[PDB]
Amino acid sequence: LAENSMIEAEEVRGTLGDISARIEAGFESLSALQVETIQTAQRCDHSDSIRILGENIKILDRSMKTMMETMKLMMEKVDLL
Amino acid sequence: AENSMIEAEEVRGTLGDISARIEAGFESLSALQVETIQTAQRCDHSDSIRILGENIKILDRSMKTMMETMKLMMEK
Amino acid sequence: NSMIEAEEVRGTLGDISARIEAGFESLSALQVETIQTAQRCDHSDSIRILGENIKILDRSMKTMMETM
Amino acid sequence: AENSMIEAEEVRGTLGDISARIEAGFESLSALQVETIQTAQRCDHSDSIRILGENIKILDRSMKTMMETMKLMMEKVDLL
């Protein structure tokens, strides 16, 4: 049964080896998908675009202030009629 | 003696349970990872934000038109 | 010595399964928190409602233009 | 007898390699997962979006003021 012990040893090694293979197959599979996850996340970061968008809306507002000034100037003139 | 065979049978069972848990865990985590990337894709609104700005720009151009119109009425 | 060694291997293999379950259980907990956090970054409704307001703004501009 | 001990000794060595690979992978994936959640937090722009909308609403409110002012000139131009 000395050979028996050897076959049982080789079978144990093979299985353990396959286990290590499944563990390595997974960890890199999940890590890769995780790298694609973080990347897709970066895409959803529209911080700069929004801040720019607000500053243009602000220029807009400052242009309506201007329009009002001109508006009330016409008002004065037609009032001094 | 053959107490080794029964011992080997037990070792096979436990190791098989291990492999099952490994495959189950990785299979579950991966399915939730595909759900994560897909949900993130939804959070991308680059097109929407851009159309919004282009609308603000058109609106600004319309402001300039009124401004010219106003001064025009002034000259009158 | 075969059984005592078998008892030793069983302990280590049992510890192995525990670490596997711990790792998988922890990572999933952080992914459910991750997916939930990702869901928060969806602003489709807000972005669109904002645009509809700008459309009213333009509509009012066109109204002013005709008034003049 | 001895050949059994070395066989057992190998199992200890190999299983230790197994535990190490397990710990390395889990530690690595989690660290990259915490990087994921933090990056996701960056993508939340609710506050900015909200202030953005409130400014456009003020913009509309000011337009209504202009409409009222513009009519005033029409009432006075209507004098004639």
Residue numbers in the entry:
A (entry chain C): 82 to 162
B (entry chain B): 83 to 158
C (entry chain A): 85 to 152
D (entry chain D): 83 to 162
Kindly provide excerpts from the paper associated with this entry.
Mononegavirales encode a viral phosphoprotein (P) that binds both the viral polymerase (L) and the viral nucleoprotein (N). The P protein acts as a molecular chaperone and is required for the formation of a functional replication/transcription complex. Phosphoproteins appear to have a globally conserved structure with a central oligomerization domain flanked by largely unstructured N- and C-termini.
In the present study, we present the structure of the phosphoprotein oligomerization domain from BoDV-1, revealing a tetrameric assembly in solution and in a crystal structure. We determined the structure of the BoDV-1 phospho­protein using X-ray crystallography. The A–D tetramer is essentially identical to the E–H tetramer (r.m.s.d. of 0.31 Å for equivalent Cα atoms). The oligomerization domain is bipartite, with residues 82–124 forming an N-terminal helix of 63 Å in length and residues 129–162 forming a C-terminal helix of 53 Å in length. The BoDV-1 structure determined here is assembled from approximately straight helices, similar to the Sendai and Nipah paramyxovirus structures although lacking the N-terminal capping helices.
